[PDB]
Write a protein that binds this ligand. Sequence first.
Ligand SMILES: [Cl-]
Length: 827
Amino acid sequence: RDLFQFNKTVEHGFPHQPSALGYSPSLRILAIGTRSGAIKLYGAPGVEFMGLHQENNAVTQIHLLPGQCQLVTLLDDNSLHLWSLKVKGGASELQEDESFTLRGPPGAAPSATQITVVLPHSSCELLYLGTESGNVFVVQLPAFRALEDRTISSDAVLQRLPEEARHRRVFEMVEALQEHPRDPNQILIGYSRGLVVIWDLQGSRVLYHFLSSQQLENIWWQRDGRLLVSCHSDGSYCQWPVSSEAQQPEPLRSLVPYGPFPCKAITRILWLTTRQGLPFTIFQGGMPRASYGDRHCISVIHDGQQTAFDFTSRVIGFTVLTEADPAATFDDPYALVVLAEEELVVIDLQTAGWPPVQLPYLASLHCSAITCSHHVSNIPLKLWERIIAAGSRQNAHFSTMEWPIDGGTSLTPAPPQRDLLLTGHEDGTVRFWDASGVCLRLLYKLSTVRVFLDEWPPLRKVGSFDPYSDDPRLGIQKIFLCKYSGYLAVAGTAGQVLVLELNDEAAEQAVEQVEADLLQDQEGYRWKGHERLAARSGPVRFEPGFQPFVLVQCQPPAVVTSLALHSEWRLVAFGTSHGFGLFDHQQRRQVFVKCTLHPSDQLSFTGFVRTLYFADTYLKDSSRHCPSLWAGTNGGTIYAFSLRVPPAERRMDEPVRAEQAKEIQLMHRAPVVGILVLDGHSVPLPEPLEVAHDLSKSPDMQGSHQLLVVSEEQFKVFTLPKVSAKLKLKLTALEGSRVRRVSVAHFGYGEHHLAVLTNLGDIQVVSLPLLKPQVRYSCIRREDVSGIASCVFTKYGQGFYLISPSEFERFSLSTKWLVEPRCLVDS
Ligand SMILES: [Cl-]
């Protein structure tokens, strides 16, 4: 009751399927819209807002009103929505105030009022809406009263033009609609066919116009408003002077920025001024159709320097952060924020070389496909500061610029403990995330692949997302990190097992290789496809961080399915689809292997090891406890091997010798998803070196131990060493649910329980050792098999699961580790 509680929290990572980018230069807050109707506001680390439109429709445009805590969104159904940041109870929240849909006359065409450009007037009193017909409608905010009196019709503009500039297309689409930077009375209107016009609002007269030789794509207005830069569908951009003395000019300077060959269109362009007199020219597209046409590029030109920033995904919006306010003399940019379809990129425009800016949030967790995730709770400070130190040297090429999107004040207090989330990926990388309280930022990246062996246009790949799968054999399957010693054990898809060690400096060392033939005592089989990797024979140099020292290749090179790493005994247990083996990573010697293949297996088998578990309990003698290894398979078989490890003073002088002690078969023959041994007080045996750092955690050896077996169908408790049954809990026979994952959870005095994730998406808690159902929740849905398979628990009642390939959703079952992210946006 007063210690169990499940509530939704926040989400981590890059939003799934974005479609709109917004940014308030005053508030310094980034806004992202998705194809599911969600808008996410991002400010300083800890300041985040999320909203949902009641209709499931993609967000196409986001316009944060100038100098106000409001924004206007446009969905693909031509709907407008006014959102605000109401401060309710010392902390601001996001809410949708009003809504409006542009209609048009009844008998009119539906696309005639399809909004193309939304112009928030500087007064924050009017919205100027460009449509596909060419008409610009005026909407007054709030109340959203479409003022039909102020409508600027298409032919109403053409009547002020000479006769030779009146050739109008049926749908003269408004592709440009901007306000004069120094005159709120003048607005610019841009049509597709090439007509650009400056309009006198209070007077209804055309003050300036020119026809474009090429189709109009976009335009940009200089700070003083005395020059226009238009980009066109032929891949060219030209400059136009704006002066009341010459209301009808010809272009000042035209060029196609990339080669004399045909080019793709330039969809957008910016003309930013600097105090040094060197303007920034930033345009998207314009790449040649000849070869570089299928590439998403954004080019920046400044002081004789050109760089075509190329992204691995579509560009669904970009902006440039400037030091200027609407009243400043010069723009002076310093950052280029690009919201790609799969990632977010920030480029430092001030530092010479234009280096990437490190992201404090919005990091694309799926830059490589996530294959596994492992959570380690409460990291000691000596290892914590060591990982953040080794992870700082690898981020040297990044900019020294502080995160520019610092808008807002996070009210969430500091995290209680240092939690750590690890993610294995398909390309062989492991990433260390700071899942302490809420914010999930990257600390260190590990690349395991190291064990296995033009000039124009100025293209330059940026971002970390790789949309290709070079080799799936590199995929990380199992991850184990000892927070006390720094030993890391990772397992791959091709049957590789790497045991790494964390040191502070670099090293050039050879990685010893040991073949673990799981089929040594059985012959008559031959592997078919997915052959093993190829390790470097020579001594490989490694950067500071987790350096590997031993490699164990399983034969056959099947996927590793279970992993256990005992740091004190210096043993690592690995298991594949056919068998398992115990390895002595201190002497780099194979202790034993056992082929578990049933005489008649499948074409998943029965001898498929699923769980590995080290323990120091009583197996044979009732009064002598010795190290042991436990292995559970799909056939309900539970193996137990008595281990004899030497003391630390002779660990390098005697081999570790094992001997099978028990073979237990559950009579319902359900797969074993968890083995666990309890001490005299029914407390689970502590992890390796957990007692070494807190000797009061020494397990009760006086008093009979208990064996806890968790299968896919039921829970059974035994009594060591005689392993006689004493308790049962047939969950599948009752609720009709099967156990997907189980984990010991310590809630808060504080006693231990069993956290169970069923295949239904529910999560139940079970007491120890009586196995009494304490509570039952509903985290994931039943149809969400993708997310329920990649769901991870923590020691203290917290969890993570994937709502999309890119986003983790966090949840907490404990009342003591609740976190409600509060933040404040002011002025
Ligand atoms: Cl702990």
